[PDB]
Design a binder for this molecule. Sequence first.
Ligand SMILES: [Ca+2]
Ligand SMILES: [Ca+2]
Ligand SMILES: [Ca+2]
Ligand SMILES: [Ca+2]
Ligand SMILES: [Ca+2]
Ligand SMILES: [Ca+2]
Ligand SMILES: [Ca+2]
Ligand SMILES: [Ca+2]
Ligand SMILES: [Ca+2]
Ligand SMILES: [Zn+2]
Ligand SMILES: [Zn+2]
Length: 616
Amino acid sequence: GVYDYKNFGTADSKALFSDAMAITLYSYHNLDNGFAAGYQHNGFGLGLPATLVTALLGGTDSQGVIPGIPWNPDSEKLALDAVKKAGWTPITASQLGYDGKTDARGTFFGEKAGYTTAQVEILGKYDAQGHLTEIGIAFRGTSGPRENLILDSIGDVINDLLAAFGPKDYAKNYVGEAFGNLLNDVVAFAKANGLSGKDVLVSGHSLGGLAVNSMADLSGGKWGGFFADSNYIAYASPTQSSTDKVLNVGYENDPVFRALDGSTFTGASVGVHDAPKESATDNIVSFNDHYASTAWNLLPFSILNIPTWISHLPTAYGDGMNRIIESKFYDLTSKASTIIVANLSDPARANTWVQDLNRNAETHKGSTFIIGSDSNDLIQGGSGNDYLEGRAGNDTFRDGGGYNVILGGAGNNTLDLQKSVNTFDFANDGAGNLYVRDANGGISITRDIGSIVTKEPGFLWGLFKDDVTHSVTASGLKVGSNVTQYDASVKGTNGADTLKAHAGGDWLFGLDGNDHLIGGVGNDVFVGGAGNDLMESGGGADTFLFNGAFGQDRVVGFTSNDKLVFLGVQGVLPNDDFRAHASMVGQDTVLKFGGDSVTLVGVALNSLSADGIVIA
Ligand SMILES: [Ca+2]
Ligand SMILES: [Ca+2]
Ligand SMILES: [Ca+2]
Ligand SMILES: [Ca+2]
Ligand SMILES: [Ca+2]
Ligand SMILES: [Ca+2]
Ligand SMILES: [Ca+2]
Ligand SMILES: [Ca+2]
Ligand SMILES: [Ca+2]
Ligand SMILES: [Zn+2]
Ligand SMILES: [Zn+2]
């Protein structure tokens, strides 16, 4: 998964991420809440006020209205209830033995000149018996003194800030300067409660995220090395530490995210700065009204241009990346996966297709994950391989080709093929998968899509209608009661079956259990399913399709004109080809995808070509 961290598995890494997000949002105390609500209801026509940028960078004399920043009067309680719902309670000064200042929210403040407006939340997570089990440190970074955020233009302010982070280790030393003594008290408190460094989660967003990287960098030498083994997840940070400790999460179109290289100001800092970085998630797109709009994108992309900070806002971090976490596709992803997250206002969502525009970013490689919202989305996949997730709402999908998985989710969902139904083949395994194969051979596996919309240029049956709506049934595609019949198939059971294709060619659906699939002289598509399946070509131009936890399969009689298709399988890195997954065991080629494998019986590895092994 994209948020894998150290050596936690997929699941623990996800629980870790979800906690980092919760304590990070808590540190802002709903700063952007009224703004996010306004954008969601109305769109981004009014753009983004300079006052919001200065608030994000400099903090607030709170809590209440600020010009151009709509204020939710329940900002504070909403935020506190939320962090608690996530399992976290602020720890008091008194619990810490800390002699310094906390305000009425229980927030802690920086300790040295230049750092006194810096903020941090110290939170505890407790088991059902009320024993402390984890400590959360959520940095809320500031630039320093507020009156310095209006002395020049907002663009000068931003530009000067960035140029100041690297010289004299300003960004590196930040947490040591601001919170050096507080963090000593945290060590003592951790130890008295039987916690070590591994039980501490450190997070924060922005200058907060810059603080997370600072603390990582300081963790080896300060506080007796106690936090060296701590968990560091930083959101939308301009900087990256020189350790291997920090998971730097951000949107690729967030102009603050990765603005600096380490903490070094470069020629790209004020432009597009989308070079790959080891600690970073490089290719997560926030598909919001700005990213989507030609008008908003007229000016060159730059942090110095305030509208672009729309993609920096913390509410869309929490909302969008939680949907990644909840995704059915989550365990297919990895750190550099291209993930497009539906982040449009209610107005834009009605008429805008969520798609990878690849705007202001290096060329996206490998498969694309598009994650919808819980409302009605319009989702467009590209001509390569796509994983499209509708979630709730009535969603409409389009896709331009390749191999795809399309998950309608709850609701009444539609796949609009934009082409004649005569250019497609439809198969159905009776277990909720409808397969859609285009005229070039590209297969989509679809679930929970009840309508297919075709475009017929000629009259269908003499009967029907440029756009034509077919209803997906157990027995075929229905218009009223025209049938487009499913391709011929043989279906098994969830036990061990032998299935035999007819000479004409059959989709063979093994399903669960260890199946024996006997193709014939014709063109078969083999779907062994779960279990360890033995699949025999039997002649023809055959396709073998692997999805999910497909087991340990054996393929017999594979030739040049046959094709393997791996779609929604484990262990695939962007632009892996088959060689990355291939080895010889005896006279057999073996392809491994996580703990699943295909053995090509009697096939020499050197005899194979990438064109017959599709890795999506
Ligand atoms: Ca990128
Ligand atoms: Ca596609
Ligand atoms: Ca949806
Ligand atoms: Ca849906
Ligand atoms: Ca079976
Ligand atoms: Ca099977
Ligand atoms: Ca065959
Ligand atoms: Ca199998
Ligand atoms: Ca063949
Ligand atoms: Zn306990
Ligand atoms: Zn056999």
